[model samples]
Target: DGDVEIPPNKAVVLRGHESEVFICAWNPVSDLLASGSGDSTARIWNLSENTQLVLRHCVPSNKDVTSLDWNSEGTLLATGSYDGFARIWTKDGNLASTLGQHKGPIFALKWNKKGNFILSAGVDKTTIIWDAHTGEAKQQFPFHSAPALDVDWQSNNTFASCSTDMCIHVCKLGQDRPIKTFQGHTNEVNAIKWDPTGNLLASCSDDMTLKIWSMKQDNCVHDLQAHNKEIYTIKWSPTGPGTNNPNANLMLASASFDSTVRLWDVDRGICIHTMTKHQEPVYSVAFSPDGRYLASGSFDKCVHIWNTQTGALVHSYRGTGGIFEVCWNAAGDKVGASASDGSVCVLDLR
Candidate 1:
């Protein structure tokens, strides 16, 4: 840990939403950023042209725009709401589809790499794959016995979902049941992710454990119990195989309520570094495009950029409210963070 630096306006603070901002993400190839909040509006901030567009959820008591994401091609944006609907929008801020299938709030949403299908998990105990182009609920999987919390794609036709049922189900398109089901965590599984090559899957839980699963085995490959508190989420680096950085070793990072971020070398099943800078629960962590740095956001209102190799604190910024999400643009020179105070700030690393 190092001294916290209050960098003088290294960030461009954006404001407009009337309630707490919950989630934020940057498009794959541009400074186009989107943030959803309690205001029921997802704002697309175009930093390149210095303009912003407001997308109203429009539903009566729309609740909160809880989750959102961009397609791989960065052409369209998909958002999930507590109003139990998922909506797709074009980059020009035009509504393309209002996908309503989940009977309750949606907690997780993602676009497949092919950009043709959108995956969503909801409190209604179902996960659905929606056609991005046709705007239809292609298939809905009702496998989870409890509220589905998060879902991640393993392949274009397959995905992994975790829930309060304390299980992880790997389901595929056109299938009647899960291809692979994992049951090991004592508490509810919070998040799951497929590795860069889609060979290994990682799951984190409220039991403070991170488990690595392999398709070939019934037991977990690695049971890493390094964090002392609930593991909020895990993300694999975009490297090793079929990724942008082939030279870098594959690594996984976990953010925990223990106020720490642990970088693990997935191959060795060991933590390479435990980043201890945040003073509260770490909610989000994203690897830079080239895999050199990781930005972590916490409830303490701080975002710390740590160098992956040396584990050094490279850049840090404190926001006005709890930071719910942090993301890097394709260029990796800018970071976008959404805060609980209804502000979205872009750190100008350039």
Candidate 2:
């Protein structure tokens, strides 16, 4: 008999979650990958060792883990669950802190660049910044009249938040009121992300548009609309100033419900590349460490890696499940994906 066969692109396949895995994030400093699932658990998989460490929430049912993030140091993992609590964990699988402040489920969470504060957006229509050290709510911003969908840090002290109220707010840690507000999207804002330099902000919405904002301008610098459906998420290539590839231009990528991902030239306010190879809605997109390649995961059960500059398909693999999240390691040699089939797999690019 022949030996068991596996996908040629797969380097590792991990199965520990009992339910659908909703999110996955690669450690910034190590090979550790953290995945959150509807099983009310988050697991840490060491890609090198193929071992897993599971982090559990209170009870089991109705505690679906919704969002996750790793601090800049990679020593702590932050996970948000439907139970309205965000828990912090050590790499060793120890529960360090339980941040319980939100009135409802948390949809998104992020660690600041300084690695000393954690920001979370909740269904309660509020955003809270918790001190990383004490696990205390340092400041809570109740600016969104509707549920806040996402939050992105511009700096250690300043950040931006988007909401279903169709507005974005720029808030600082010590300020009681938002420094600025934006209201251009006709529908709910789904995601917001800052460029490498933190000087520009990009937001995507259910209105099938992408907009760029700067502190110097009273209105949007660019309003790009090409997607046939709502934009699900957006990411900025880390190639511009303050990043390693300072000579290369920074680009923004938007994943949409129309089964495509488009790269934008923010300066010229034009759509540079539209990657439409997938037959299903694309959910997650990440840029490589060097910003030369893009990895996208889709519900069609595929992960595709494309050359960022030329828009060429460099690699593609079909997995066993609908992909929810995809990420690249700091070294950029591997791509990890969490799926709806209760599986997480890594693709070896090396």
Candidate 3:
């Protein structure tokens, strides 16, 4: 791996909120960034001006906000709150629909590629696919010893999930049982992502490693060991448009409790770089659409940005509380952060 050099104060400080923020999402199509937090409100930030906007206010539950996913159009947002309920909202802040939690806490939520359904994984150790419009469960997969920590949708109608079982389950829409169950990690599985081509899946775990598996090879093809603690999230780079070099060997970035963000050459199955600037655990990491910048949120109450190639600190945003999730705009033009303090803010990199 390579070492990173970060300059002090490379971040923009956005201050607001009274508690913890849980999730921040970049609007897939617009310059708007939406964030959800423990404060029971999801706020919007205009990345164009580095200003916070109070998009909509809602009191869905008394608990912290855990997860939020925007539809492909960025017209609607779905959230899983600590109150154990999932709610859908209009782009302008109207409550569109609500999905009840009959079992346990909803930890992970995602939208299908077509935006037709929302998939959720819960602390009850079950995964439920819900009708996006009707808020009805379309299908439910239940068979895990521990809660499913993360759920991801892949192409070909296949999706994958990671869990405390230390297993990655790959299942299709119609099958009740997973066609593939990948097991290798000695600790809990925390994150899973599919390549843009859907031919490979990358995952991270409490074992302090990152792994890549081939759907075709049907075996663990890449093992990335770099982080000193559990890895929380991993993302595969997308092809086309303003991105990193086309010849780059399937790159991946991981966020870790070890306080570092690591990158990998997924094709060669090797760790290539480690960006260590935070003094606290990182809960989530994301790549800009252009693949030139990396964003990470930390328990240290800040979000840091870095140049992907040189591992140089670009900019950071200081928040009121610990940051749990960070995301970038679809075109990778801007970024956002979810604050544990119940506030979400968006930053304009331009």
Candidate 4:
């Protein structure tokens, strides 16, 4: 699509879920990927062996898995669901713990870099910080009047959340008052991601725009109108910012319902490139850890990979149902895609 240079390779499709795949997460330290689907279950896929193993079925009271993330140690996978709950799953596909009694459907989740805590937010109009191992609520804050749509971790004690309320709030662990609230989007905020250095935040919204916020000024520095449809995902490249060049732009990848994925020079608020070949809405987009490749999933039931700098489509795959979520492993050498076919595919870039 849209001038992306394909690597002369195609993505291998994997299918099995009986419903829509909502989220996928890669273990930080292993060759495993975990995915959650509308079927009310999660699966652990072995990238090395290419096999799908079921994780804990969703809790009877909480069946929708909206988001997933692996702790730093890869020992625990945190899952957020439509039923307003967060679950901790062991690496072996067993139930480790669960935190519910939330205010509403859980939409966003993140683990601290140290793996000591989990940050989660939902339709409940609040955000909660929980101890990962103990499953205990560390602190709960009511930050939004509207449902929380996304949460991102800057560190163990600092994070940010956005909501349909059209706002982004920067907060710390013990502080009850937000350090800052970014107000600029004209509609619901769908995604927010922190730069590797934790100095800037990128967000997308129904306003059909993307924004970059700097913590220093506690205000938005650049506004980007990159897509014509609802933007679904935004992620900072795991490569972090360039050394010896603090002003160097951190790369970002964004997926939009406009049936395209676009790369951005975030600091410049400019579209660096576009991937527009999908026949359906682009639901997910991610940059590999090394910043060499980009992966995007679409309702067209395909996942496409591209060489970031050259804008070449490197890999493509077709599958049953639609592709909704995609994620790269910590090593940036692997990928996981969630599809409407009710299944998750684990891929090995190595």
- Can you give the lDDT of residue 154 in candidate 2? 90
lDDT (Cα, tens digit) per residue for candidate 3, span 139-257: 88885679888988986367888899988898778899987988888899988998876778888888988888876665688777758788888887654322344654457888788
Best by TM-score: 1
Best of the candidates, lDDT: 1
- For model 4, how does the per-residue alpha-carbon lDDT over 1-350 read when each residue is reduced to its tens digit? 34433233434556666677888877878778788877777778776644677764442444777778888778888888777778888888788787654766788888888888888897889999998767888899898999988888877798999998999999998899998999999999998988888888999998888899998775578888878888888887666454333443468888888898888887666888888889888888887766788898998887788888877887766666688887888777777788876767655565
Go through the candidates in order and give each one's C-alpha lDDT. Answer: 0.91, 0.90, 0.76, 0.80
List of clashing residue pairs for candidate 2: none
Which window of ten consecutive residues has the lowest lDDT sum in model 3?
A: 3-12
Order of quality (TM-score): 1, 2, 4, 3
List the candidates' TM-scores in order: 0.97, 0.96, 0.87, 0.90
| Model 4 bad stretches (over 4 Å) | 1-16, 49-52, 58-62, 240-249, 348-350
- Cα lDDT tens digits, model 1, 1-350, are 56646466668899998888999999887788999998999999988844899998873365799999999888899999988889998887888899775898999999998989999999999999999888989999999999999999999999999999999999999997999899899999999999988999999999999999999998999999969999997988888879889889888999999999999997888999999989999999999989999999999999899999988998899889999999998889999999999999999875
Pick out the ten consecutive residues of candidate 2 with the lowest summed lDDT.
Answer: 1-10
**Deviation of model 4 at 151, angstroms:** 0.5
Query: What would the per-residue lDDT of candidate 2 be over residues 63-177, giving only the tens digit for each residue?
Result: 9999999988889999999989988999889999997758979999999988999999999999999998998899999999999999999999899999999999999999999
Q: Give per-residue lDDT, candidate 4, residue 264.
A: 88
TM-score of 2: 0.96
Model 1 CA deviation exceeding 4 Å by range: 1-6, 59-62
Better of 2 and 4 by TM-score: 2
Model 2, 313: alpha-carbon shift in Å? Answer: 0.6
